[PDB]
Amino acid sequence: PPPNEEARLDILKIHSRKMNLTRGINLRKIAELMPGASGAEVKGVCTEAGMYALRERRVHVTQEDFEMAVAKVMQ
């Protein structure tokens, strides 16, 4: 639970690099919702966002997938 905002965002950019992010997604806004998250939890938000997409037979991940993932992993 040590990575700061920029450190969190960097973890998000790294793991989203190969995902098919929908046009206009905002990873910084996702980082802002994660104060106090461990680096692993940030990674989890990426993978969990992907799972929400697959669950809906979607190859493209949306801001909502990410939003829902954050609440899932931390809440």
Structure tokens at 56: 């809906």
Experimentally, the structure was elucidated by X-ray
Q: How far apart are CA 47 and CA 21, in angstroms?
A: 13
Compute the residue count for the chain: 75
Residue where the block lists tokens 């450190």:
7
Closest CA to 45 of 25, 60, 65: 65
Which residues, in sequence order, are CB contacts of 21 under 8 Å at separation 6+? 60, 61
53's tokens = 């997409």
Q: Give the resolution to one decimal, in Å.
A: 2.1
Domain ranges of the chain: 4-75
Measured in whole angstroms, the distance separating CA 11 from the mean position of its chain's CA atoms is 9
Identify the H or E element spanning 61.
strand 60-61
DSSP letter (8 states) at residue 59: S
b/e code 7-19 from CB counts within 10 Å (16+ = b): ebbbbbeebbeeb
Give the DSSP per-residue string, 8-52: HHHHHHHHHTTSEEPTT--HHHHHHT-TT--HHHHHHHHHHHHHH
State in words which class domain 4-75 has.
Answer: mainly alpha
